[PDB]
Coordinates of C-alpha atoms in Angstrom, one line a residue:
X1 CA -12.4 -37.4 3.5
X2 CA -10.7 -37.5 6.5
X3 CA -7.8 -35.3 8.5
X4 CA -4.5 -37.2 7.6
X5 CA -1.6 -36.6 10.1
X6 CA 1.8 -37.7 9.0
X7 CA 4.7 -36.9 11.7
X8 CA 8.5 -36.4 10.8
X9 CA 11.5 -36.0 12.6
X10 CA 11.5 -31.8 12.4
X11 CA 7.7 -31.6 12.7
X12 CA 4.1 -32.9 13.2
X13 CA 1.9 -31.9 9.4
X14 CA -1.7 -32.1 9.4
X15 CA -3.2 -32.5 5.9
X16 CA -6.6 -31.5 4.7
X17 CA -7.7 -31.4 1.1
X18 CA -7.2 -28.0 0.7
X19 CA -5.2 -27.0 3.7
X20 CA -1.7 -27.9 4.8
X21 CA -0.7 -27.2 8.0
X22 CA 3.1 -27.3 9.5
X23 CA 3.3 -27.3 13.0
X24 CA 7.3 -27.6 14.8
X25 CA 7.8 -29.6 17.9
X26 CA 9.8 -27.3 20.1
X27 CA 8.0 -23.9 20.3
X28 CA 4.5 -24.6 19.2
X29 CA 4.5 -23.0 16.2
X30 CA 3.4 -23.1 12.6
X31 CA 6.2 -23.3 10.4
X32 CA 4.8 -23.4 7.1
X33 CA 1.3 -23.3 5.9
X34 CA 0.2 -24.2 2.1
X35 CA -3.1 -24.3 0.5
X36 CA -3.6 -27.2 -2.1
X37 CA -6.7 -26.1 -4.0
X38 CA -4.8 -25.4 -7.3
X39 CA -1.6 -26.8 -6.6
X40 CA 0.6 -26.8 -3.5
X41 CA 1.0 -23.3 -2.6
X42 CA 3.2 -22.0 0.1
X43 CA 1.4 -19.3 1.1
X44 CA 3.1 -18.8 4.8
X45 CA 6.3 -19.1 6.0
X46 CA 7.6 -18.3 9.9
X47 CA 9.7 -15.4 10.5
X48 CA 8.6 -14.9 14.0
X49 CA 4.8 -15.7 13.6
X50 CA 4.4 -18.9 14.9
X51 CA 1.9 -18.2 18.1
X52 CA 5.4 -18.3 20.0
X53 CA 4.3 -17.9 23.6
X54 CA 6.0 -15.4 25.1
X55 CA 6.9 -14.3 28.6
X56 CA 7.7 -10.8 27.6
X57 CA 10.9 -11.3 25.2
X58 CA 11.5 -14.8 26.4
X59 CA 10.3 -17.5 24.7
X60 CA 9.0 -20.9 26.0
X61 CA 9.6 -24.2 25.3
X62 CA 7.3 -27.3 25.7
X63 CA 8.0 -29.5 28.7
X64 CA 6.8 -32.6 27.1
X65 CA 5.9 -34.0 24.0
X66 CA 2.7 -32.7 22.4
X67 CA -0.2 -34.8 22.3
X68 CA -2.5 -35.7 19.2
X69 CA -6.1 -35.7 19.6
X70 CA -9.9 -35.7 17.9
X71 CA -12.7 -36.6 16.6
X72 CA -12.7 -40.1 15.3
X73 CA -9.7 -42.8 15.7
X74 CA -9.1 -43.7 12.0
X75 CA -5.5 -45.4 11.8
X76 CA -4.8 -42.9 9.4
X77 CA -5.5 -39.1 10.9
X78 CA -8.7 -38.2 12.0
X79 CA -12.4 -37.7 11.0
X80 CA -13.9 -34.6 12.4
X81 CA -11.6 -32.4 14.2
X82 CA -7.8 -32.7 15.4
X83 CA -5.9 -31.4 18.2
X84 CA -2.1 -30.5 19.0
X85 CA -2.1 -30.3 22.7
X86 CA 1.2 -28.2 23.6
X87 CA 2.2 -27.8 27.2
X88 CA 4.8 -25.3 28.0
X89 CA 3.9 -25.9 31.8
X90 CA 2.0 -22.2 32.8
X91 CA 1.0 -22.2 29.5
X92 CA -1.0 -24.9 27.5
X93 CA -2.0 -23.8 24.0
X94 CA -4.4 -26.4 21.4
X95 CA -4.6 -25.9 17.9
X96 CA -8.1 -27.4 16.9
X97 CA -8.6 -28.0 13.0
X98 CA -12.1 -28.9 11.9
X99 CA -12.8 -30.5 8.4
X100 CA -15.0 -27.7 7.3
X101 CA -13.3 -27.0 4.3
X102 CA -13.0 -22.7 5.6
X103 CA -9.5 -22.8 5.7
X104 CA -10.0 -21.8 9.7
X105 CA -8.5 -23.4 12.7
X106 CA -8.5 -22.7 16.7
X107 CA -5.5 -22.0 19.0
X108 CA -6.9 -22.7 22.4
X109 CA -5.2 -20.8 24.7
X110 CA -4.6 -21.3 28.7
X111 CA -2.2 -19.5 31.1
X112 CA -2.0 -19.0 34.5
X113 CA 0.5 -15.8 34.2
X114 CA 0.0 -13.0 31.3
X115 CA 2.2 -13.8 28.0
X116 CA 2.3 -12.9 25.0
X117 CA 1.4 -14.9 21.7
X118 CA 3.2 -13.6 18.0
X119 CA 0.7 -13.3 15.5
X120 CA 1.3 -15.0 11.5
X121 CA 1.8 -12.1 9.3
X122 CA 1.4 -13.3 5.3
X123 CA 2.2 -9.7 3.9
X124 CA 5.3 -8.4 3.1
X125 CA 4.9 -4.4 4.2
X126 CA 2.6 -3.5 7.1
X127 CA 0.9 -1.4 4.5
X128 CA -1.5 -4.5 3.6
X129 CA -2.0 -5.1 7.2
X130 CA -4.5 -3.7 9.7
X131 CA -5.3 -4.0 13.3
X132 CA -9.5 -3.4 13.1
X133 CA -11.8 -3.2 15.6
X134 CA -11.8 -6.7 17.3
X135 CA -9.9 -8.6 14.8
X136 CA -6.2 -8.6 13.0
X137 CA -5.7 -8.6 9.4
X138 CA -2.8 -9.5 7.4
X139 CA -3.1 -10.3 3.2
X140 CA -0.5 -10.7 0.8
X141 CA -1.6 -9.6 -2.7
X142 CA 0.8 -12.1 -4.3
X143 CA -0.5 -15.1 -2.7
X144 CA -4.0 -13.8 -2.0
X145 CA -3.6 -15.2 1.1
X146 CA -6.1 -13.3 4.1
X147 CA -5.6 -13.7 7.9
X148 CA -7.9 -12.8 10.1
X149 CA -7.6 -13.3 14.1
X150 CA -10.6 -12.7 15.9
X151 CA -8.6 -11.3 18.9
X152 CA -11.5 -9.8 21.1
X153 CA -9.3 -6.9 22.2
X154 CA -10.8 -4.4 19.8
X155 CA -9.0 -1.4 19.5
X156 CA -6.6 -2.2 22.5
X157 CA -4.7 -4.6 20.3
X158 CA -1.5 -3.9 20.5
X159 CA 0.2 -6.0 17.7
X160 CA 0.6 -9.6 19.8
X161 CA -2.0 -10.7 21.9
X162 CA -2.1 -10.9 25.7
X163 CA -3.1 -13.9 27.3
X164 CA -4.3 -14.1 31.0
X165 CA -6.5 -17.0 32.0
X166 CA -8.0 -18.8 29.4
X167 CA -8.7 -17.0 25.8
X168 CA -9.7 -19.0 22.2
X169 CA -9.1 -17.7 19.4
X170 CA -10.3 -17.8 15.7
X171 CA -8.2 -17.6 12.7
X172 CA -9.2 -17.7 9.3
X173 CA -5.6 -18.2 7.3
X174 CA -6.1 -19.2 3.6
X175 CA -6.7 -17.5 0.6
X176 CA -9.5 -14.6 0.5
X177 CA -12.8 -15.4 -0.3
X178 CA -16.0 -13.5 0.8
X179 CA -17.9 -16.8 0.6
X180 CA -15.7 -18.0 3.5
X181 CA -15.4 -15.5 5.5
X182 CA -18.8 -15.4 6.1
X183 CA -19.2 -18.6 8.0
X184 CA -16.3 -17.6 9.7
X185 CA -17.6 -14.7 11.5
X186 CA -21.2 -14.6 10.8
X187 CA -22.1 -11.6 12.9
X188 CA -19.0 -9.6 12.4
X189 CA -18.7 -9.9 8.4
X190 CA -20.3 -6.9 7.3
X191 CA -18.4 -4.6 9.4
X192 CA -15.2 -6.7 8.4
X193 CA -15.5 -5.9 4.7
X194 CA -15.3 -2.3 4.5
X195 CA -12.4 -2.6 6.7
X196 CA -10.5 -5.2 4.3
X197 CA -11.7 -4.1 1.1
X198 CA -10.0 -1.3 1.5
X199 CA -6.4 -3.3 1.6
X200 CA -4.7 -2.9 -1.3
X201 CA -5.0 -6.0 -4.0
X202 CA -8.7 -7.0 -2.2
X203 CA -10.7 -6.4 -5.0
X204 CA -9.5 -5.5 -8.7
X205 CA -12.5 -5.3 -10.7
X206 CA -14.3 -7.9 -8.3
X207 CA -17.2 -5.6 -6.6
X208 CA -20.5 -5.2 -7.6
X209 CA -19.8 -7.3 -11.2
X210 CA -18.8 -10.5 -9.8
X211 CA -19.9 -11.0 -6.3
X212 CA -23.0 -9.7 -8.9
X213 CA -22.6 -13.7 -10.5
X214 CA -22.1 -14.9 -7.1
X215 CA -25.0 -12.7 -6.0
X216 CA -26.9 -14.3 -8.3
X217 CA -25.7 -17.9 -7.7
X218 CA -25.2 -17.7 -4.3
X219 CA -29.1 -16.0 -3.6
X220 CA -29.7 -19.2 -5.9
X221 CA -28.1 -21.3 -4.2
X222 CA -30.0 -21.5 -1.2
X223 CA -32.3 -23.5 -0.9
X224 CA -33.3 -23.9 -5.0
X225 CA -32.5 -27.2 -5.2
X226 CA -28.9 -28.7 -4.2
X227 CA -25.6 -27.7 -6.1
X228 CA -26.6 -29.3 -9.6
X229 CA -30.2 -28.2 -9.8
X230 CA -29.2 -24.9 -9.4
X231 CA -26.9 -24.3 -12.2
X232 CA -29.7 -25.3 -14.8
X233 CA -32.2 -22.1 -12.9
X234 CA -28.2 -20.0 -14.4
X235 CA -28.9 -21.4 -17.7
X236 CA -32.5 -20.5 -17.8
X237 CA -32.1 -16.7 -16.5
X238 CA -29.5 -16.1 -19.4
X239 CA -32.1 -18.3 -21.8
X240 CA -35.0 -15.6 -20.9
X241 CA -32.7 -12.9 -20.8
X242 CA -30.7 -13.8 -24.3
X243 CA -34.1 -15.1 -26.2
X244 CA -35.3 -12.6 -27.6
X245 CA -31.6 -12.5 -29.3
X246 CA -31.7 -15.9 -30.5
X247 CA -36.0 -16.2 -31.6
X248 CA -35.4 -12.5 -33.6
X249 CA -31.8 -14.3 -34.9
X250 CA -22.6 -15.4 -36.5
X251 CA -23.4 -14.0 -32.8
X252 CA -25.0 -16.9 -31.5
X253 CA -21.5 -18.6 -30.6
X254 CA -19.9 -15.2 -29.8
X255 CA -22.1 -13.9 -26.8
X256 CA -22.2 -17.5 -25.2
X257 CA -18.2 -17.3 -25.0
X258 CA -18.4 -14.6 -22.5
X259 CA -20.7 -16.6 -20.1
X260 CA -19.0 -20.2 -20.5
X261 CA -15.9 -18.5 -19.7
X262 CA -17.5 -17.0 -16.4
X263 CA -19.6 -19.4 -15.8
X264 CA -16.6 -22.0 -15.3
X265 CA -14.2 -19.3 -13.5
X266 CA -17.3 -19.3 -11.2
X267 CA -17.7 -22.5 -10.5
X268 CA -14.5 -22.9 -8.2
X269 CA -13.6 -20.2 -8.5
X270 CA -14.7 -19.0 -4.5
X271 CA -16.6 -22.0 -4.6
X272 CA -14.2 -25.1 -3.3
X273 CA -17.1 -26.4 -1.2
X274 CA -19.0 -27.1 -4.6
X275 CA -17.0 -30.6 -4.4
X276 CA -16.3 -31.0 -0.6
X277 CA -18.4 -30.6 2.2
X278 CA -20.7 -30.0 -0.1
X279 CA -22.8 -32.1 -2.2
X280 CA -23.1 -35.4 -4.3
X281 CA -25.9 -34.2 -7.1
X282 CA -27.7 -37.0 -9.1
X283 CA -24.5 -39.2 -10.4
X284 CA -21.4 -36.6 -9.8
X285 CA -18.7 -34.3 -7.7
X286 CA -20.0 -31.6 -9.8
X287 CA -16.2 -30.0 -10.4
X288 CA -14.9 -32.8 -13.1
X289 CA -13.6 -34.2 -14.8
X290 CA -15.9 -34.7 -17.4
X291 CA -18.1 -38.3 -17.7
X292 CA -21.4 -39.9 -19.7
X293 CA -22.8 -36.0 -18.7
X294 CA -21.3 -34.8 -21.4
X295 CA -20.7 -38.2 -23.2
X296 CA -24.9 -38.4 -22.9
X297 CA -24.5 -34.4 -24.1
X298 CA -22.4 -36.0 -26.7
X299 CA -25.6 -37.3 -27.9
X300 CA -27.1 -35.0 -26.9
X301 CA -25.3 -32.5 -29.4
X302 CA -26.6 -35.4 -31.9
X303 CA -29.7 -35.3 -30.5
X304 CA -30.2 -31.9 -30.8
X305 CA -29.2 -32.5 -34.9
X306 CA -31.7 -35.6 -35.1
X307 CA -34.1 -33.0 -33.5
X308 CA -36.0 -30.0 -35.2
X309 CA -22.9 -35.1 -35.3
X310 CA -20.1 -33.6 -36.3
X311 CA -20.1 -31.1 -33.0
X312 CA -20.2 -34.1 -31.2
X313 CA -16.6 -34.7 -32.1
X314 CA -15.7 -30.9 -30.5
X315 CA -17.6 -31.4 -27.7
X316 CA -15.4 -34.4 -25.5
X317 CA -12.3 -33.1 -26.1
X318 CA -13.9 -30.1 -24.5
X319 CA -16.1 -31.4 -21.8
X320 CA -14.2 -34.3 -21.0
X321 CA -11.4 -31.7 -20.1
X322 CA -13.3 -29.4 -18.3
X323 CA -15.9 -29.6 -15.3
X324 CA -19.2 -31.4 -15.0
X325 CA -20.5 -27.3 -14.2
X326 CA -20.0 -26.8 -18.1
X327 CA -20.8 -30.5 -19.8
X328 CA -24.5 -29.4 -17.3
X329 CA -24.1 -26.0 -18.6
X330 CA -23.8 -27.3 -22.4
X331 CA -26.2 -30.1 -21.9
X332 CA -29.5 -27.9 -20.7
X333 CA -28.8 -25.2 -23.4
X334 CA -29.5 -27.6 -26.1
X335 CA -32.3 -29.1 -24.0
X336 CA -33.9 -25.7 -23.8
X337 CA -33.5 -25.7 -27.3
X338 CA -35.4 -28.8 -28.4
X339 CA -38.4 -27.8 -25.9
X340 CA -38.8 -24.4 -28.0
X341 CA -38.7 -26.1 -31.5
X342 CA -41.0 -29.1 -30.6

């Protein structure tokens, strides 16, 4: 739970849990970007994308070694934010990366003369690029990476950032996740989404169906309890809706697999702050890695037989290999069964 700074001979690397940034030593460019959320995924490489500071066809080299500063001084990287300051001598550029697990960083730029700053494109063609009102969007369907750069030039944006005086730019660079876009741009989220939804491959059978699932979950996640105690309430609306099937009850096992397959891929899924910057609930992290939650749920499957043994062997292999979300789902299933008959 710190931002680790690794420095090599060709580059400076800033590593957070889900974000991996490589910055150069010469032009002040982001060389490469990897999202580490599921595996190490290479979602960006420099074409000339890297926030080069241009005096109009003329790239600039720094006049001194970059300075690293930040919040907290752990002798292994920082604690809250990290700043890599680059000095080109009439242009100063500062990259600030705060540990929000939002995939979001800040390029703070100060110039005495109008200069051009190149902008990162993750896309393949310009069909997945947009120059929307007060934002530049670039999306790669393959890696599902969204670049949102708030340039505040809106409708006048020419393809490179013009910088005269001081300017701050907020760059969302990471996966395309609607939960994260709102924290990044709360004020403009609504007008942004209408324009981004139109980009080829931004949705795909995920409109009023899946964010209807994270509709139920995000509307109930705040501020019904913490993250764990609000998983059980979803199990209760599945119980209210499906108990008329199970009170008048074969299908018992089948139709639960849709919701098991769906709540499992929903936990995270667009919910990676469900385990970082989020919270402990009871004894867990919540995105497991099973535990005595699902082992006392082993005994809980034994106590459903004992209530009003073999199935408790089938449980561990699945639920110690699966997140606590599913161990808490399964546990809560049988505990509203014993409360039904006794």
